[PDB]
């Protein structure tokens, strides 16, 4: 029971946990996912329709469905953005990722 391994499981689990049986996320599933899993993020998102904007971008979002792969896109987008900000602006104690996502906004 490794640690990267848990992280990956979390990721898989979360997608599936919110997606449910149908296998994909609709804009609604995704909004709640982000409401629970990225608490302050979406709130501090100063566009109030950021979810719409994010949904509209998602690689395969065109049938309104959101694949795991698409879902992963999002994780990559956030993580990598987090990391870039982390390295430039700071370079342990938890609660930082949480604090970085706060300053993050879409294109």
């Amino acid at each position: 029971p490794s640690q990267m391994e848990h992280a990956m499981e979390t990721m898989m689990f979360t997608f599936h946990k919110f997606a449910g049986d149908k296998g994909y996320l609709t804009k609604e599933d995704l909004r709640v996912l982000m409401e629970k899993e990225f608490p302050g993020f979406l709130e501090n998102q100063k566009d109030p329709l950021a979810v719409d904007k994010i949904m509209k971008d998602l690689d395969q979002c065109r049938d309104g469905k959101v694949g795991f792969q698409s879902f992963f896109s999002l994780i990559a987008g956030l993580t990598i953005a987090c990391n870039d900000y982390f390295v430039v602006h700071m370079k342990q104690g938890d609660s930082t990722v949480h604090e970085i996502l706060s300053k993050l906004s879409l294109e």
Partner: peptide
């Protein structure tokens, strides 16, 4: 081969 979205700030 996947395309992700870009977050700044």
């Amino acid at each position: 081969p996947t395309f992700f979205p870009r977050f700044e700030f």
